[PDB]
Design a protein around this ligand. Structure first.
Ligand SMILES: C[C@@]1(CC(=O)O)c2cc3[nH]c(cc4nc(cc5[nH]c(cc(n2)[C@H]1CCC(=O)O)[C@@](C)(CC(=O)O)[C@@H]5CCC(=O)O)C(CC(=O)O)=C4CCC(=O)O)c(CCC(=O)O)c3CC(=O)O
Lengths: 119, 119
């Protein structure tokens, strides 16, 4: 009924996609969502429209799109809401729910501190 | 003796810089590092060389640079190691320690899950 679509930037290097794939596996391992797909904005497959359609084709009416980006910017406020046709292929009786990016979350400061000490 | 320099992407929008500023305040509030500075790779001040120099000028011999980026890519493997002159400046007796990005950390999946439910 509900699907989780994780959306990342994409790069010409492979690390960005690898990251999204790992993240999606980890959310799969938590068994919270019936359906979990990934999409990359640029340079990589699957693309955002691809991931969105793949979620509909598995029988999702409500698509939760989380932008796995640190902050808001051009990507999260123009490009992505575009590719989701939220500002200008979605069946009329399906809603895209566009969520918020990671932000300055306390857990991010925990991670930064670990990273500072090579952990 | 040691300084923490947090480095982010930077944006034509202000949100990226706001994020780094908030993150740096939160690490300041944990009282772990004598010195804590921020730098943006593009279109914002302070820049990476700026932040690095500001840390030396406050008496740091060892500069911990943490790239606040989700994954490796062009930015973390070319641009930043360049701007830090690690590939192609800095006092002989000062070491830059270039740390690892955020990666597919379990806490990132926690954050994604919260973000999926609007929390
Ligand atoms: C659009 C632009 C500026 C603009 O329009 O403001 C901008 C903006 C941002 N990029 C951000 C993230 C990443 N960008 C990349 C990669 C590229 N980004 C590129 C360009 C630009 N990036 C400026 C276009 C200038 C122009 O073309 O006029 C490319 C296409 C360069 C090109 O092709 O010119 C190059 C790939 C090709 C290459 O260079 O080889 C990667 C992957 C990687 O680094 O490999 C990450 C993930 C990093 C991570 O993993 O976290 C964030 C913060 C996102 C966040 O908050 O997480 C912002 C801020 C925002 O979105 O506002």
């Amino acid at each position: 009924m509900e699907a989780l679509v994780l959306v990342g930037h994409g790069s010409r290097l492979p690390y960005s996609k690898e990251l999204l794939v790992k993240l999606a596996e980890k959310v799969k391992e938590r068994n919270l969502f019936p359906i979990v797909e990934i999409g990359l904005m640029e340079f990589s497959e699957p693309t955002i429209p691809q991931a969105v359609k793949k979620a509909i084709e598995q029988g999702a009416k409500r698509i939760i799109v989380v932008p796995v980006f640190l902050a808001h910017g051009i990507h999260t406020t123009r490009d992505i809401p575009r590719l989701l046709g939220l500002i200008e292929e979605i069946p009329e009786d399906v809603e895209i729910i566009y969520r918020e990016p990671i932000g300055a979350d306390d857990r991010i400061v925990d991670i930064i501190i670990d990273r500072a000490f090579g952990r």
